[PDB]
Design a protein around this ligand. Structure first.
Ligand SMILES: CC1(C)S[C@@H]2[C@H](NC(=O)CCCC[C@H](NC(=O)C[NH3+])C(=O)[O-])C(=O)N2[C@H]1C(=O)[O-]
Length: 345
């Protein structure tokens, strides 16, 4: 690969701050040589600086953790990707036709209940931040709406899919998702900054605070750091660090977390758009210089995450901005992948 471009990474972070991120940071693990940059503040009220060791909420990056657990269950003979969801969770869905593979790739047609919750950004956050939901509560909220398409038909993102994934993990293992993440992923990879504490609202240890951008332009930011994330759970509640998400996606792509057969299934791409695909709890992004990278993005209130690795896991990058509901910031932070993988123009 080309050399990572630290001047370009520095410019991306400075642009994100100019667009409303209180703080922004990035860590690259380039085959054993570390790159680490940060600019701005973890806490905008106290002024404490952000750093690449600050813990944060990874949002839908959590789905890659859920998918790894489910694909290990396929390796163990406990789960068949082409069986019906209802085979394992009787009576759950009105269509006994929807399969596990379809949920894991966002091809199920299940309505995304969070489009009801967050029609208004700050009111919807204030509504859910201190609520505790069961998995079944969230499925019932989805099923108030009919499906949006035929099973298998189209990519349509829905958090409901990885609520189903959490329910499958707990049903088939007899354990909580926190126990399965710890035993199958966090402990074997020594992810000392990585946690699943739901429904606790505290982020353990030194962390970046999250700042939710209101829908009104120029409105005051809302501290969204402490919430249950119970509206997402196995779709979005993991806490981690840049070093630990680099370790995780490098281990995944280098073949340490499942059989070769299941990794191959995880990388069967469904088209998202002309430069992106979706596998099984895994995203592919095609970069300008002809390189593809693999991993996941996350959005949870106050935190935007990108965490991607090269095909062989030898270069990994994790970037974090501690704001959300700011599409300019989101789009700017994607440029860290260009600078880290494609290097200087
Ligand atoms: C598909 C995504 C982008 S959204 C999905 C999941 N996060 C959510 O579903 C939260 C949606 C509300 C986010 C909120 N926005 C609003 O409230 C809008 N009114 C904000 O910006 O904080 C996550 O994480 N995924 C990202 C993913 O996979 O990258």
């Amino acid at each position: 690969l080309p050399a990572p471009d630290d001047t370009g990474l520095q410019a991306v972070l400075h642009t994100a701050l100019s667009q409303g991120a209180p703080g922004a940071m990035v860590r690259v693990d380039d085959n054993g040589t570390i790159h680490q940059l940060s600019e701005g503040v973890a806490d905008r009220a106290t002024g404490r600086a952000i750093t690449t060791t600050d813990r944060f909420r990874v949002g839908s990056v959590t789905k890659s953790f859920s998918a790894v657990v489910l694909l290990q269950l396929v390796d163990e003979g406990k789960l068949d990707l082409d069986a019906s969801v209802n085979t394992y969770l009787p009576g759950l869905l009105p269509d006994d036709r929807i399969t596990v593979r379809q949920v894991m790739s966002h091809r199920s047609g299940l309505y995304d209940y969070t489009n009801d919750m967050f029609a208004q950004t700050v009111p919807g956050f204030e509504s859910v931040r201190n609520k505790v939901f069961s998995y079944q509560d969230l499925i019932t909220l989805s099923l108030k709406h009919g499906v949006t398409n035929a099973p298998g038909a189209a990519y349509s993102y829905s958090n409901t899919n990885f609520v189903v994934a959490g329910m499958l993990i707990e049903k088939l293992t007899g354990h909580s998702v926190a126990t399965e993440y710890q035993n199958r992923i966090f402990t074997p990879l020594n992810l000392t900054d990585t946690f699943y504490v739901h429904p606790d609202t505290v982020i353990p240890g030194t962390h970046a605070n999250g700042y939710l951008t209101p829908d009104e332009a120029g409105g005051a930011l809302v501290d969204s750091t402490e919430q249950t994330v119970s509206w997402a759970q196995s779709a979005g509640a993991v806490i981690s660090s840049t070093q630990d998400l680099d370790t995780f996606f490098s281990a995944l792509m280098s073949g340490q977390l499942m059989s070769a057969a299941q990794l191959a299934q995880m990388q069967q791409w469904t088209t998202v758009n002309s430069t992106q695909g979706y596998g099984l709890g895994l995203r592919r992004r095609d970069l300008s210089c002809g390189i593809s990278v693999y991993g996941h993005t996350g959005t949870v209130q106050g935190y935007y995450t990108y965490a991607f690795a090269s095909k062989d896991g030898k270069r990994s990058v994790t970037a974090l901005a501690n704001t959300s509901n700011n599409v300019n910031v989101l789009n700017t932070m994607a440029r860290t992948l260009e600078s880290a993988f494609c290097g200087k123009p």
